[PDB]
Amino acid sequence: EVETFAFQAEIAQLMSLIINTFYSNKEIFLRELISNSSDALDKIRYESLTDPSKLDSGKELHINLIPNKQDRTLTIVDTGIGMTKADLINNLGTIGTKAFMEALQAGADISMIGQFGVGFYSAYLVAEKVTVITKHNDDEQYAWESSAGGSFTVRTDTGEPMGRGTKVILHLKEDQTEYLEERRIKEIVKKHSQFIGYPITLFVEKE
Ligand SMILES: COc1ccc(-c2snnc2-c2cc(Cl)c(O)cc2O)cc1OC
């Protein structure tokens, strides 16, 4: 009930570079993922203009951020358009990077991943493992997942349903746990993402 796929070569290269780099400016991953969530929300919102049954799976258009120190995960949840099994494998599996890859001339990364369509992968600046959970109106709920190393998996999600949208779960590296800190997140969002056109809500952890 689980399929394994290979990353297109250019993507695996890019990932290996990100995973390893000592790049300082790691917080930019948060801007890339919020930026992707914002695009997905634009998509569903604009589709709903001509066909409001679109929103039947959820009217709220927002972005949630969820630190979990017991699990050492940070989750970004949106209720944008979401991805069918096929968008999921295309979008996360293939490329584009060449641009970027050849962009860091003879060097190691830059805050320009975003302007290059591959900003998602910057998640690997801070995470040893990413899981992507996604619900498009047309399809079932799927879980994508990869610890890098050239392959990802795709299966049908068994967990709580989402109605619609995308959920990006980062399993944080041992020494990047500052992004589970309420203070650091607020600061990061304010710096890189406050002019995003949807509510971004930080969930504070309970005692
Ligand atoms: C163009 O840029 C794109 C941006 C978003 C997506 C998609 S569609 N459904 N979800 C997202 C999305 C994807 C990711 Cl990775 C994420 O972190 C959050 C999400 O809501 C597709 C894009 O390209 C088809």
Q: Is 83 in the pocket of ligand 1 (CB under 6 A)?
A: yes
- Residue listed under structure tokens 């809500």: 201
- Find all residues with CB under 8 Å of 86, minimum gap 6, and list them: none
Rounded CA-CA distance 6/10 in Å is: 11
Alpha-carbon distances, residue 9 vs 53, 107, 206 (angstroms) = 40, 19, 43
**Nearest CA residue ID for atom 24, ligand 1:** 91
**For residue 81, which atom of ligand 1 is closest to its CA?**
9
Furthest CA-CA distance within the chain: 50
First to last CA, the chain: 37
Q: For residue 73, which of 182, 154, 192, 179 has the smallest C-alpha distance? A: 179
Contact 65, 75 (CB under 8 A): yes
Q: How far is CA 25 from the centre of its chain?
A: 17
How many structural domains comprise the chain?
1
Contact 161, 135 (CB under 8 A): yes
In 25-48, which positions are buried (b, 16+ CB within 10 angstroms) versus exposed (e)? ebbbbbbbbbbbbbebbeebbeeb
**Nearest CA residue ID for atom 14, ligand 1:** 36
- Find all residues with CB under 8 Å of 57, minimum gap 6, and list them: 135, 137, 163, 164
Neighbour tally for 176: CB within 10 Å: 18
Q: For residue 157, which of 135, 138, 142 has the smallest C-alpha distance? A: 142
Q: Is 119 in the pocket of ligand 1 (CB under 6 A)?
A: no
Rounded CA-CA distance 119/11 in Å is: 12
Alpha-carbon distances, residue 199 vs 34, 77, 114, 120, 164 (angstroms) = 11, 12, 21, 20, 17
Distance of CA 27 from the midpoint of ligand 1 (Å): 19
Rounded CA-CA distance 121/8 in Å is: 13
DSSP-derived 3-state class of residue 33: helix
Distance of CA 47 from the midpoint of ligand 1 (Å): 15
* The pair of three-digit structure tokens given for residue 64, joined into one six-digit string: 């949630």
Structure-determination technique? X-ray
Resolution of the experimentally solved model in angstroms? 2.5
Q: Is 39 in the pocket of ligand 1 (CB under 6 A)?
A: yes
Q: For residue 80, which of 165, 140, 9, 193 has the smallest C-alpha distance? A: 165
Distance of CA 92 from the midpoint of ligand 1 (Å): 9
Rounded CA-CA distance 155/147 in Å is: 15
Rounded CA-CA distance 24/160 in Å is: 36
Q: Domain range holding 103?
A: 1-207
What long-range pairs does 136-145 form, CB within 8 A, spacing at least 24? 136/81, 136/82, 136/83, 136/84, 136/87, 136/164, 137/54, 137/57, 137/81, 137/82, 137/164, 138/84, 139/84, 139/85, 140/85, 142/83, 142/85, 142/88, 144/88, 144/89, 144/92
- Residue listed under structure tokens 């290269």: 13
DSSP-derived 3-state class of residue 143: strand
**CA angle (142 as vertex; 18, 82 as ends), nearest 5:** 80
* The pair of three-digit structure tokens given for residue 81, joined into one six-digit string: 């358009």
Q: For residue 80, which of 134, 161, 138 has the smallest C-alpha distance? A: 134
CATH of the domain at 9: 3.30.565.10
